[model samples]
Target: MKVAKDLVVSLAYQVRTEDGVLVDESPVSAPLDYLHGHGSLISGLETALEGHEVGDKFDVAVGANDAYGQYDENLVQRVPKDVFMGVDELQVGMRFLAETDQGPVPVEITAVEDDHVVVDGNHMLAGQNLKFNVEVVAIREATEEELAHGHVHGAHDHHHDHDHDHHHHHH
Candidate 1:
């Protein structure tokens, strides 16, 4: 079957930075699966995969805008430590979900001081072009539950027991 809206696609993929540094990859035995046309995959990759069928192998380069988006310096800010009143220890590299007008945004701590914390809200891959080597391993109609959930179900052993907490755009 060809990749299309609401279909489930399983693929093995390796993502690398423009510098050829490996960022992430799926195991051949456990290819990544997602509901095609949903925002589960980055827009560029998903668009490139449209009309492809099982066994198709290709490489696509995605710009920062189409991937994680351009890094915005405005998204980095220093906030008072009181914002995390309940947390006992604040350290660099710690991540927290901050509620914003756009909804919950993941922020990583870049600097921690006695009075304030510097948080970067930009996606880690933001501002970088990425190259992906992808091989379509399988394609099948999505289950009713998968379509309703807006994601693949059994492919990753991910259960929808909780809310749709999985972030869709991370590859």
Candidate 2:
């Protein structure tokens, strides 16, 4: 099957900002593994990747609206530092998981104070235009377990509480 809902897709990609500055990319030796049509990626990238299969390579330009959406001030809020109870050292630029379903809603610490912490729930790339060079490396039907679990195994796991150099499955 080609790339579609519930299918697992593998891609090697490079992302650049509006000024053509490289912002992100998959490792040279490994591709990014994601479940298709699962809200695991931005809307524009997903639309561009539709029906793609292995070895398909293309470039896509996504405006801020389709990419990360505009940075909304309503998502910014001041909260008691106790909300980050598990963290011993809360500092600016630190990322925390605010919520999750298919993927975690990453919240960044913008300012830290004795009583409150200023957190911005908007994605860091919000309001930025993005250009992507994407190469599809692999595709396969997702496992029952993956679909049941609501996330793909061996893919970009949303559980990031720990880091152990998780490997990607290019095939």
Per-residue lDDT over 4-112 for candidate 1, one digit per residue giving the tens place of the 0 to 100 score? 9999999888887554557689766678888998889788998898899999888889877787446878667887888778767778988777654444556788899
lDDT string for model 2 (1-171, tens) is 678888888888888755455768875357887788777878899878988888888888887678744676765778788766787778898876654222334567889988988877665546446789999888889997777776678765456545565687455
Best by TM-score: 1
161: Cα error in model 2, Å: 25
lDDT of model number 1: 0.78
Which window of 10 residues has the lowest lDDT sum in candidate 1? 156-165
**What are the root-mean-square deviations of the candidates from the true structure over C-alphas?**
15.2, 14.7
Best by lDDT: 1
Off by over 4 Å in 1: 69-127, 157-171
lDDT score at residue 109, model 2, on the 0-100 scale:
82
lDDT of 2 at 112: 91
